[PDB]
RNA sequence: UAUCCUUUGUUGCCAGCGGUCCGGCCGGGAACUCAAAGGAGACUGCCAGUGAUAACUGGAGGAAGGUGGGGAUGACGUCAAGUCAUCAUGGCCCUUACGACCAGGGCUACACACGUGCUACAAUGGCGACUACAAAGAGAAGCGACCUCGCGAGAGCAAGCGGACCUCAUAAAGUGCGUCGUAGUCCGGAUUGGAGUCUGCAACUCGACUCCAUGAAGUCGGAAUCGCUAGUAAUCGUGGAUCAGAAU
């Protein structure tokens, strides 16, 4: 069934099925089933409507999806706008050398590539 | 450093004479010193290889 | 790419006392001249003042800052930002 | 009833000392249960013979710790006097 | 029977004979349930059909290497029959191990497949060079 | 190293008896295993066949037989083989500098090419719990029982041994029970983000390791070519030398 943000674990145990989530893993898979009181050896197709309900609400309170990916993008954007080499490394569109990369470097690059 | 090496000061603070510690004479490291030589584990080795330490010799197998 | 090998540099006149203050927590802001030194664990949480060449600026070291030199957080030149200089 | 276990690294220095311990006690006291070998714990090393290549070489080495029993029963005053006074072997560790 | 004792060894990978005999006897059981015949009888016939009689060898006789037909010895026919039956079984697509052996022992009696293709190919190579028959050897 | 015997035993074992918190543990005794030393033992001698002989072939006896099996050992000489940076040595050459100290930088720089290696694709399998057997080795500031804190690495505390009586150890596969279905998957682990431990004066190009997250290529491979005949191949795990620490 569907729990968090876009996830459809089908035909598998309650444990391994939840392991397919970007946020929770094995450690979290066991603790959640123990808190909601659910058999870990039961398939997702054998779970009742009441069991899944208590599973969604609890697993709900967690961090996942886009909102998290934007936090990552921002983290890479902050050191990118500054004078940090690591940020320039993320781009790697910078000079790898020791001569100039800005111009006159076609002897290694080859034909001019589109901007 | 120059501030931590207050050990050089013969007279300890409020603490009893027991306050006086050790500190290496060469590097000035308090971690692991060797009373006999007063040098740290790092300096005793460097001084050993150089041969500046009399009577000292590298043990062999 | 940066360079280290296995000989990270930490001026002894800014690494031994910084450990002193560790006797019972930390100590108020300090001031070091050699920005060449690199930032490491112990220095976390403390406020070290780096010399820009004119004065000492308070640089609150953080775990995320660990690894970079003290000089990287102490700008040499001074640009006003001729404008509304917002954000 | 005094048992004397003699252990050492060198096999010869033991036969010398052990034999002496017996011969000397053979007079003053009993004939002793006789000096014996006992199990010898062996320590071996397997390092490369040649420093390079010839990976297929690395000879075998061994450092043995021999033991002895002797065991002298019916000890007399002179039986011990013949022990305490004379002691040559240095590579032999006695245990009476 | 020594034949069965020999067939259980070729199926023994890593020295697990206890499990090996488990799949063997489980195959003869399902073999009698699928076919109305004694497991033993259906077993022997399966090995008999997979055996060559004349093998052609290569020999340099003066100028070039000629192919001379020769008779095979009874000691090699038993090994090949056993080996080609287990290899063909591991070729089937049924997950059940005991089922791959039961079906193979049945098809081996019916006769048809790759093992048979090799039998015909060898039978064809022979007689094709009957002009070299006088070299019976 | 393989069989046997003699000498010897705080290793061994009710083999035999007694006690047993039934752990050799204790009493006790050396048989057995083992440990160590010495010694015994194959030599074609016997039987049949062939042969001029040597010897070859078959067979019995026998723990092993025809040099039973593994080591060290490498002829006159060759390539003017390698090393004068191991060392020694003839000639030649330099002696403010091709000597010395110190601070700071690389060898692990890449569009590519090669050699030598490693890890792979499963259910005669992977995983979790429980549980049964090995040998050879290492340990002084070192191996680290046990306790406590932490998911863990590890940390604090701390017994014992100096060691065939304390520790490294848990042996792994194996066995019993349960779980997983053929899809790039609970196959496979690359790469990358975050956090942390440890060694070291100090690991941003240059560490190893632990945990979380991510989780690629790969579904077995175009022309040639390599390793082996028995407890060996193949396969699985373990200890050690070098050593503070990149050994696949």
Swiss-Prot record, chain A:
Record keywords: Ribonucleoprotein, Ribosomal protein, RNA-binding, rRNA-binding, tRNA-binding
One Pfam family in the UniProt entry: Ribosomal_S13
GO molecular function: rRNA binding; structural constituent of ribosome; tRNA binding
Gene3D superfamilies, per database record: 1.10.8.50, 30s ribosomal protein s13, domain 2 (4.10.910.10)
Gene Ontology BP, a term: cytoplasmic translation
Key word Nucleotide-binding present: no
SUPFAM superfamilies given in the database record: S13-like H2TH domain
InterPro entries: Rbsml_uS13_C (IPR027437), Ribosomal_uS13 (IPR001892), Ribosomal_uS13-like_H2TH (IPR010979), Ribosomal_uS13_bac-type (IPR019980), Ribosomal_uS13_CS (IPR018269)
Annotated segments matching region Disordered: 93-115
Any one cellular-component term (Gene Ontology): cytoplasm
Subunit structure as annotated in this protein's UniProt entry: Part of the 30S ribosomal subunit. Forms a loose heterodimer with protein S19. Cross-links to the P site tRNA and weakly to the A site tRNA. Forms two bridges to the 50S subunit in the 70S ribosome, contacting the 16S rRNA and proteins S19 and L5.
Classification via HAMAP family: Ribosomal_uS13 (MF_01315)
UniProt record similarity statement: Belongs to the universal ribosomal protein uS13 family.
Protein name: Small ribosomal subunit protein uS13
Swiss-Prot record, chain B:
Gene Ontology CC, one term: small ribosomal subunit
One function term, GO molecular function aspect: tRNA binding
Signal peptide location: none
A single BP term in Gene Ontology: translation
Coiled coil: none
Keywords associated with the record: Ribonucleoprotein, Ribosomal protein
Subunit and partners: Part of the 30S ribosomal subunit. Contacts proteins S3 and S10.
Family of this protein: Belongs to the universal ribosomal protein uS14 family.
Function: Binds 16S rRNA, required for the assembly of 30S particles and may also be responsible for determining the conformation of the 16S rRNA at the A site.
Protein name: Small ribosomal subunit protein uS14
Species, as recorded: Escherichia coli (strain K12)
Residues of the full protein shown: 41 to 101 of 101
Swiss-Prot record, chain D:
Regions that span the bilayer: none
Keywords, ordered alphabetically: Ribonucleoprotein, Ribosomal protein, Ribosome biogenesis, RNA-binding, Transcription, Transcription antitermination, Transcription regulation
Pfam family, one: Ribosomal_S10
Assembly information from the UniProt record: Part of the 30S ribosomal subunit. Can also form a heterodimer with the transcription antitermination protein NusB. Binding of S10 to NusB is mutually exclusive with its incorporation into the ribosome. The rRNA transcription and antitermination complex (rrnTAC) consists of RNAP, NusA, NusB, NusE (this protein), NusG, SubB, ribosomal protein S4, DNA and precursor rRNA; S4 is more flexible than other subunits.
Gene Ontology, cellular component aspect: cytoplasm; cytosol; cytosolic small ribosomal subunit; small ribosomal subunit; transcription elongation factor complex
Name of the molecule in the record: Small ribosomal subunit protein uS10
Species classification: Bacteria, Pseudomonadati, Pseudomonadota, Gammaproteobacteria, Enterobacterales
Highest taxon, organism lineage: Bacteria
Gene Ontology BP annotations: cytoplasmic translation; regulation of DNA-templated transcription elongation; ribosome biogenesis; transcription antitermination
Record flagged with keyword Transcription regulation: yes
Signal sequence residues: none
A GO MF term: tRNA binding
Organism: Escherichia coli (strain K12)
Family: Belongs to the universal ribosomal protein uS10 family.
Curated annotation (Swiss-Prot), chain E:
GO MF annotation, one: structural constituent of ribosome
UniProt keyword terms in alphabetical order: Ribonucleoprotein, Ribosomal protein, RNA-binding, rRNA-binding, tRNA-binding
Keyword Ligase set for record: no
Signal found in the keyword field: no
Alphabetical GO biological process terms: cytoplasmic translation; negative regulation of translation; ribosomal small subunit assembly; translation
Cellular component aspect of the GO annotation: cytoplasm; cytosol; cytosolic small ribosomal subunit; membrane; ribosome
Functional note: One of the primary rRNA binding proteins, it binds directly to 16S rRNA where it nucleates assembly of the head domain of the 30S subunit. Is located at the subunit interface close to the decoding center, where it has been shown to contact mRNA. Has been shown to contact tRNA in both the P and E sites; it probably blocks exit of the E site tRNA.
Additional free-text comment from the UniProt record: The strain K12 sequence is shown.
Subunit structure of this chain's protein: Part of the 30S ribosomal subunit. Contacts proteins S9 and S11. Cross-links to IF3 and the P and E site tRNAs.
Family per record: Belongs to the universal ribosomal protein uS7 family.
Name of the protein described by the UniProt record: Small ribosomal subunit protein uS7
Record gene name: rpsG
Region of the whole protein represented: 20 to 156 of 179
């Amino acid at each position: 069934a569907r729990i968090a943000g876009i996830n459809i674990p089908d035909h598998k145990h309650a444990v391994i099925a939840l392991t397919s989530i970007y946020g929770v893993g094995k450690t979290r898979s066991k603790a959640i089933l123990a808190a909601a009181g659910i058999a870990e050896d039961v398939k997702i197709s054998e779970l009742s409507e009441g069991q899944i309900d208590t599973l969604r609400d609890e697993v709900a309170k967690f961090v996942v999806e886009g909102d998290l990916r934007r936090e990552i993008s921002m983290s890479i954007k902050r050191l990118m706008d500054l004078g940090c080499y690591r940020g320039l490394r993320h781009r790697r569109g910078l000079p790898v050398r020791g001569q100039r990369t800005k111009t006159n470097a076609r002897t290694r690059k080859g034909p001019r590539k589109p901007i | 450093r120059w501030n931590a090496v207050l050990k050089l000061q013969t007279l300890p603070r409020d603490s009893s004479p027991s306050r006086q510690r050790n500190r290496c004479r060469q590097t000035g490291r308090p971690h692991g010193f060797l009373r006999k030589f007063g040098l740290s584990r790092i300096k005793v080795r460097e001084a050993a290889m150089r041969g500046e330490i009399p009577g000292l010799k590298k043990a062999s197998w | 790419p940066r360079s280290l090998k296995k000989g990270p540099f930490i001026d002894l006149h800014l690494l031994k006392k910084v450990e002193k203050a560790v006797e019972s927590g930390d100590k108020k802001p300090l001031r070091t001249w050699s920005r060449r030194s690199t930032i490491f664990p112990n220095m976390i949480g403390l406020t070290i003042a780096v010399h820009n060449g004119r004065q000492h600026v308070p640089v609150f070291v953080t775990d995320e800052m660990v690894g970079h030199k003290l000089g990287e957080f102490a700008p040499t030149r001074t640009y006003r930002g001729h404008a509304a200089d917002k954000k | 009833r005094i048992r004397i276990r003699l252990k050492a690294f060198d096999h010869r220095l033991i036969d010398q000392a052990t034999a002496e311990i017996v011969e000397t006690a053979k007079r003053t006291g009993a004939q002793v249960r006789g000096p014996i070998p006992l199990p010898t714990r062996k320590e071996r090393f397997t390092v490369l013979i040649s420093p390079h290549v010839n990976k297929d070489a690395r000879d075998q080495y061994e450092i043995r710790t021999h033991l002895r029993l002797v065991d002298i029963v019916e000890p007399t005053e002179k039986t011990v006097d013949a022990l305490m006074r004379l002691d040559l072997a240095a590579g032999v560790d006695v245990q009476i | 029977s020594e034949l069965l004792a020999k067939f259980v060894n070729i199926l023994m990978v890593d020295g697990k004979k206890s499990t090996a005999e488990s799949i063997v006897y489980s195959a003869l059981e399902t073999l009698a349930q699928r076919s109305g015949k004694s497991e033993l009888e259906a077993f022997e016939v399966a090995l008999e059909n997979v055996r060559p009689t004349v093998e052609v060898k290569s020999r340099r006789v003066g100028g070039s290497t000629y192919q001379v037909p020769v008779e095979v010895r009874p000691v090699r026919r038993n090994a090949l029959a056993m080996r080609w039956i287990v290899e063909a079984a591991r070729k089937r697509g049924d997950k059940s191990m005991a089922l791959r052996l039961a079906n193979e022992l049945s098809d081996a009696a019916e006769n048809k497949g790759t093992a048979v293709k090799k039998r015909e190919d060898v039978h064809r190579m022979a007689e094709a060079n009957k002009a070299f028959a006088h070299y019976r050897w």
